[PDB]
Every structure is written in structure tokens, then in C-alpha cells.
Amino acid sequence: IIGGTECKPHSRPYMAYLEIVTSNGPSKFCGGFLIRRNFVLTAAHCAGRSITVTLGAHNITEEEDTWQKLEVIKQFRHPKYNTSTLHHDIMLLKLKEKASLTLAVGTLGRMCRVAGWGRTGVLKPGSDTLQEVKLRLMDPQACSHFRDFDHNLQLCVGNPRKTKSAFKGDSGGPLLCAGAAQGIVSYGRSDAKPPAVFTRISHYQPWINQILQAN
Numbered sequence: 001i002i003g004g005t006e007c008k009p010h011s012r013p014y015m016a017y018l019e020i021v022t023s024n025g026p027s028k029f030c031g032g033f034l035i036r037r038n039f040v041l042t043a044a045h046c047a048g049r050s051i052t053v054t055l056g057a058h059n060i061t062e063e064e065d066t067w068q069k070l071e072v073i074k075q076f077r078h079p080k081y082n083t084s085t086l087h088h089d090i091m092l093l094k095l096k097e098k099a100s101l102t103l104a105v106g107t108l109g110r111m112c113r114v115a116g117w118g119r120t121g122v123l124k125p126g127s128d129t130l131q132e133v134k135l136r137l138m139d140p141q142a143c144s145h146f147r148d149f150d151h152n153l154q155l156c157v158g159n160p161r162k163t164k165s166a167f168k169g170d171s172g173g174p175l176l177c178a179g180a181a182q183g184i185v186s187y188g189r190s191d192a193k194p195p196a197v198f199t200r201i202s203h204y205q206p207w208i209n210q211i212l213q214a215n
């Protein structure tokens with residue numbers, strides 16, 4: 001998160017920190033959010049050979065009683081996900097067991113808010129602590145320069161006149177508008193110039209229910 005502020009610890013208790021394993025590289029990291037006690041929603045580009053979810057985190061370098069490190073048994077990447085266009089950048093992770101509900105862990109033109117442990121700058125490292133930024137929902141033409149952006153599939157997020165933005169490592173986290181999840185951090189420019197592209201959750205809600213009901 002570029003241009004945001006540190007959250008009050010555990011103020012966003014649905015937030016999931018994902019450590020993703022690949023066979024041919026070191027670990028990578030994403031966000032996500034707990035939608036059921038045993039399901040986390042994130043972006044498809046966060047898929048890997050294996051994933052661990054950490055719930056209840058604030059300072060992700062300092063283990064604490066709020067932490068629940070949970071095994072992911074199966075990854076449900078959208079079957080039409082496209083690794084070029086990044087259409088359909090949405091994935092469900094089924095957790096091995098249902099999480100514990102605690103104070104720190106629970107399920108989940110206008111201004112919206114996005115939170116994550118991503119980089120605080122193009123050349124800056126990932127944040128130790130959960131950061132949040134408020135971003136403006138843009139008219140789709142503000143994202144035209146992303147040639148494979150589609151207004152029906154995706155939100156266009158963040159005023160190009162501000163430097164505020166999600167960035168690397170914030171992938172898969174929720175954009176909330178008036179307290180409801182509406183987007184998932186998907187992609188943007190390498191220079192972090194807004195706006196960025198978020199998956200439009202509403203479009204995927206039939207697919208989400210299908211997965212939940214079958215698992």
C-alpha cells in the first residue's frame with residue numbers, strides 16, 4: 001500500500017496473509033480475505049504449488065496469540081482465468097480446518113478502501129504491518145490504457161492525480177466500499193501510477209457460490 005496509514009492492529013479481522021510456494025522460485029506473498037471459516041478469497045495470480053494462510057496478523061514479522069497459520073488443502077482458481085489478460089483474476093482457497101472466530105479473526109465516484117502488507121513504494125520493501133488506503137472508484141475510461149480492462153469484469157480504482165494505490169504484495173486483498181467487499185486487487189502499472197485494476201466481485205458471485213456449495 002502506497003500512501004496509506006498503519007491500521008489499528010486487528011481492526012480488519014477478515015484479512016489474510018498468503019505465503020505462496022512455487023517449485024522453481026522462493027516464496028511470494030499476497031493478501032486475501034476470509035469469507036467463510038474455511039474459505040479465503042484472493043486473486044488467481046496468487047496461485048502456487050502450495051499456500052499457507054496467516055489469519056489474525058498485524059505485524060507479520062512478530063508471531064502472537066492472534067495468529068492462526070492455516071494449511072490450504074485445495075486451490076480453486078477461476079477456470080477461465082487468463083495469464084495474459086488477467087481476466088477472471090479470482091481464486092478460492094479451501095482451508096484444511098475451519099478457523100477459530102476471535103476478536104482478531106472473523107469472516108467478511110464513491111470512495112473505497114483497500115488494505116495489505118504490500119510494498120509502500122516502487123523501490124520499497126513489503127510492509128511489516130497492515131496498511132490501509134482510501135481510493136476513488138473511477139469511470140472505466142480512466143483505465144482504458146490497460147488494453148484488456150473490461151468494465152463489466154473489473155473496477156477502475158484510484159485517482160490518477162494522487163499517488164495513493166495498492167501495489168506489489170497487495171494482490172488478492174479486498175477493496176471495501178461502505179463496509180462491503182466489491183473488488184480484489186489484481187494489477188496495475190510497474191511505476192504505481194493510478195488507477196489500478198481490481199476484479200469486480202459481483203460478476204463472480206455465482207461462481208463463488210457454486211464452489212462453496214460443492215466443497
Ligand SMILES: COc1ccc(-n2cc(C(=O)O)c(=O)n(Cc3cccc(C(F)(F)F)c3C)c2=O)cc1
Pocket residue numbers: 084085086165166167168169170171185186187188189190191192196197
Ligand atoms: C494483465 O496485464 C498486466 C499489466 C500489468 C501487470 N503488472 C506489471 C507489473 C510490472 O511490470 O512490474 C507490476 O508491478 N504489477 C504490480 C502492480 C502494479 C500496480 C498496482 C498493483 C495493484 F494495485 F494491483 F496492487 C499491482 C499488483 C502488475 O500488476 C500485470 C498484468
Ligand SMILES: *[C@@H]1O[C@H](CO)[C@@H](O[C@@H]2O[C@H](CO)[C@@H](O)[C@H](O)[C@H]2NC(C)=O)[C@H](O)[C@H]1NC(C)=O
Pocket residue numbers: 059061062128129
Ligand atoms: C514489527 O515487529 C518487529 C519485531 O520482529 C520489529 O522489528 C524490530 O524493529 C526495531 C526497529 O524499530 C529493530 O531495531 C529491531 O531489531 C527489530 N527486531 C526484530 C526481531 O527484527 C518492527 O519494528 C515491528 N514493526 C512495527 C511495529 O512497525
Ligand SMILES: *[C@@H]1O[C@H](CO)[C@@H](O)[C@H](O)[C@H]1NC(C)=O
Pocket residue numbers: 080081082083084085
Ligand atoms: C488468453 O487471452 C488471449 C488474448 O485474448 C488468448 O489469445 C488466449 O488464447 C487466452 N488463453 C486462454 C487459454 O485462456
Ligand SMILES: [Zn+2]
Pocket residue numbers: 006007008011012115131132
Ligand atoms: Zn485500517
Ligand SMILES: [Zn+2]
Pocket residue numbers: 009010058064066
Ligand atoms: Zn495483536
